[PDB]
Amino acid sequence: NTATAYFNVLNAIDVLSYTQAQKEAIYRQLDQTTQRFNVGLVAITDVQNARAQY
Amino acid sequence: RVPLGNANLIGREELQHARDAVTSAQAQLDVAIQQYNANQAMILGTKLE
């Protein structure tokens, strides 16, 4: 039990780091899509998808 | 394409391009009309003999 509990914490650390990286990537995607919609190249429907993913 | 544009459910670039295509087609039709007129100016007599 001690060994398993010890390793679960490192698993959680790894998961947290990679989830933060994914969050950064998706935020940049949303920024790009919103800028593109403002400039007039995409429809409002594509903005909603980015917001949902974020 | 026009009515969908009234609401924001279609890219503005696409509608702009549709308008431009209409204008270009009109211009090319004018070109053809002028060519036909140019040929007609030599045989406006309307009698072969």
Structural class of chain B: mainly alpha
β-sheet strand percentage of chain A: under 5%
Roughly how many Å apart are the termini of chain A?
Answer: 37 Å
**Based on the structure, what is the oligomeric state of the protein chains?**
part of a larger assembly
> What portion of residues of chain B is helical?
55-70%
- Nearest-angstrom radius of gyration of chain A? 18 Å
Fraction of residues of chain A in helices?
over 70%
User: Count of helical segments of chain A?
Assistant: 2
**DSSP strand tally of chain A:** 0
β-sheet strand percentage of chain B: under 5%
Characterize this entry briefly.
Chain A has 54 residues and is an all-alpha fold.
How does this structure look, described?
Chain A: It is found in: Cell outer membrane. Chain A: Belongs to the outer membrane factor (OMF) (TC 1.B.17) family. This is part of a larger assembly, with chains A (54 residues) and B (49 residues). Chain A has 2 helices and no strands. Chain A is an all-alpha fold and 54 residues long. In chain A, helix 1 runs antiparallel to helix 2 (44-53). The longest helix of chain A is centred in the middle third of the chain and has 38 residues, at 2-39. In chain A, 0% of the residues are buried. Chain B is mostly helical and 49 residues long. Helix content of chain B is 69%, strand content 0%. Classes of the chains: A mainly alpha (54), B mainly alpha (49).
Characteristic terms for this protein:
part of a larger assembly, 2 chains, A: 54 residues, mainly alpha, 0% strand, rod-shaped, B: 49 residues, 69% helix, structural protein, Outer membrane protein TolC
